[PDB]
Amino acid sequence: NRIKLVPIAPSRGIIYDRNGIPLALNRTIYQIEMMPEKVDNVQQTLDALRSVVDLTDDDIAAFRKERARSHRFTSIPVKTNLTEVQVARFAVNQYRFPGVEVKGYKRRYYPYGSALTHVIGYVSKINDKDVERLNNDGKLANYAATHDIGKLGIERYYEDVLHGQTGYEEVEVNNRGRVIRQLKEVPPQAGHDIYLTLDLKLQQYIETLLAGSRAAVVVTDPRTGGVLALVSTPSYDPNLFVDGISSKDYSALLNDPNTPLVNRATQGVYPPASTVKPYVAVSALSAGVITRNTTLFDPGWWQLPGSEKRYRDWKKWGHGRLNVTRSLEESADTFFYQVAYDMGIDRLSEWMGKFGYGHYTGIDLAEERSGNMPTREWKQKRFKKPWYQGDTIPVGIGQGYWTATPIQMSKALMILINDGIVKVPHLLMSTAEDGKQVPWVQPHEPPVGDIHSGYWELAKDGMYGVANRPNGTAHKYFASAPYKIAAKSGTAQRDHKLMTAFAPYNNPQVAVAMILENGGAGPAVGTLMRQILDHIML
Numbered sequence: 001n002r003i004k005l006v007p008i009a010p011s012r013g014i015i016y017d018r019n020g021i022p023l024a025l026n027r028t029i030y031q032i033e034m035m036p037e038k039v040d041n042v043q044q045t046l047d048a049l050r051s052v053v054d055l056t057d058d059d060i061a062a063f064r065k066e067r068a069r070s071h072r073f074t075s076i077p078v079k080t081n082l083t084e085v086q087v088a089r090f091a092v093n094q095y096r097f098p099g100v101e102v103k104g105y106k107r108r109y110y111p112y113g114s115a116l117t118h119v120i121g122y123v124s125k126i127n128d129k130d131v132e133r134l135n136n137d138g139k140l141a142n143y144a145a146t147h148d149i150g151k152l153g154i155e156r157y158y159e160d161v162l163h164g165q166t167g168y169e170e171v172e173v174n175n176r177g178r179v180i181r182q183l184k185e186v187p188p189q190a191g192h193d194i195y196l197t198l199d200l201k202l203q204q205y206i207e208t209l210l211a212g213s214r215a216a217v218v219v220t221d222p223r224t225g226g227v228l229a230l231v232s233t234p235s236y237d238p239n240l241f242v243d244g245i246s247s248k249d250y251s252a253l254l255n256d257p258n259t260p261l262v263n264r265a266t267q268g269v270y271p272p273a274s275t276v277k278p279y280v281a282v283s284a285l286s287a288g289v290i291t292r293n294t295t296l297f298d299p300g301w302w303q304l305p306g307s308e309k310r311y312r313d314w315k316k317w318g319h320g321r322l323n324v325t326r327s328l329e330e331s332a333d334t335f336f337y338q339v340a341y342d343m344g345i346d347r348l349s350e351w352m353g354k355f356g357y358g359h360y361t362g363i364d365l366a367e368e369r370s371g372n373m374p375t376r377e378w379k380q381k382r383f384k385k386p387w388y389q390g391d392t393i394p395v396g397i398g399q400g401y402w403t404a405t406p407i408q409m410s411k412a413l414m415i416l417i418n419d420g421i422v423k424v425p426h427l428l429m430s431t432a433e434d435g436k437q438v439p440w441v442q443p444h445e446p447p448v449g450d451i452h453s454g455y456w457e458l459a460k461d462g463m464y465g466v467a468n469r470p471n472g473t474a475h476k477y478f479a480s481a482p483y484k485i486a487a488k489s490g491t492a493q494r495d496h497k498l499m500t501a502f503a504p505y506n507n508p509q510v511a512v513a514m515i516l517e518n519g520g521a522g523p524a525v526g527t528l529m530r531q532i533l534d535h536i537m538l
């Protein structure tokens, strides 16, 4: 009688929000299954089971379909998703069905559904590319009894800690290879529990605000860089994937022209437009290219020296006399055309790279694009044509070759709030079990520029003016707030509508970057931003 070792799948760790609310859970699902070879009389067994587990003709059909499409010596499911009653009836009848096994399988469950799709992700069935990745990473031995895996979001990025440590048992088997005893059991170790910075209530509020728009919202706490909300719409039900998604349902997602499978907050790549002007300003001041008193007269346009090409301001006849304060308040373009010209692409791109543009943010998700912060060498490589001075101008107002993700915008916004201190935007607060609580630790990232210069306050005061002063572009949305809001909007390329904001002005507790593709399906981005800041601050 052979003694056999058999792996035991560990329990997947639990994901909680910042208030201990479970966002991803496990449910046991029971089924009976058999290896037909090990069953003396398959047909006798199948029919006796109609009485015991309510096995149906359809069940037998699916069992036969599955029997063929399977390899020799495979345990074929006979009936799935057994009810409590049905398992009990099978249990008291088990001695009658040697070769039929009743088994419980943990499957993942997402109670809050589409509100958390992109950021939490889902686990679904392992496929061959997962196997490849596990084999290459040297992790495959630990998956001997594991058949599902995180595919995106937190479930994927933290797959290794969520999964746990496979256990095993020694079991005696007789001739025909049926289990008659368990000799020994080394139990698995459950995955670590994971505690996220997210605020579930805030996340669900934002999803409802974004309604039928293609949109992204990133809410962070600038004191920590923790992500309080990361929403991309339209979304979809992650639960669809857990038990294998229908072809009908999955093609429906792929064919949606509103591309709900895209995480727009980390993979949406847009011209950041005027939202960059606070950071360009800080750069120009720090580089000495401008001063708080630098002034030019704006006729509504700006001409490139030694050329006839003109770059227009959004305001037809100009803003008149502009310093940097008033240029931020009114989102003047002309001023920043000049600033770009005087900076040159080398300095401007170098500074914007310090703000994180063009680079990955370091967020703990694996779905992410880096965008593009253009440089001489990049245009040389990408088109094999050199950089002309006219390529620098549009970059000053966040356009040209410049593209960014909303999560990059959030990381830059926080750097301005922290006076050059760089905080990675992250979702992980801590990891638990035993536990043995391990806090997320900020990787060493040198600061930007000089903590002590008053350039940060100057740019931020301009953003305060955007929101509060009567000439500010966002006055209509924010001036009436009790707490003080500072903001900066933008419009890209109907056009995309971007908004960035933080509150309260004095000691910021929340930072928001958001965009409604093509202006959204409902309210304006400024109204939505005020609603989010109102919901948070009350």
Ligand SMILES: *C(=O)N1C[C@H](NOS(=O)(=O)O)C(c2cnco2)=C[C@H]1CN
Pocket: 272, 273, 274, 275, 314, 330, 331, 332, 333, 397, 473, 489, 490, 491, 492, 498
């Ligand atoms: C930046 O993206 N700007 C300048 C300005 N931004 O303001 S807003 O559209 O976000 O409100 C702008 C504008 C103001 N009024 C009409 O357009 C457009 C865009 C021009 N580069």
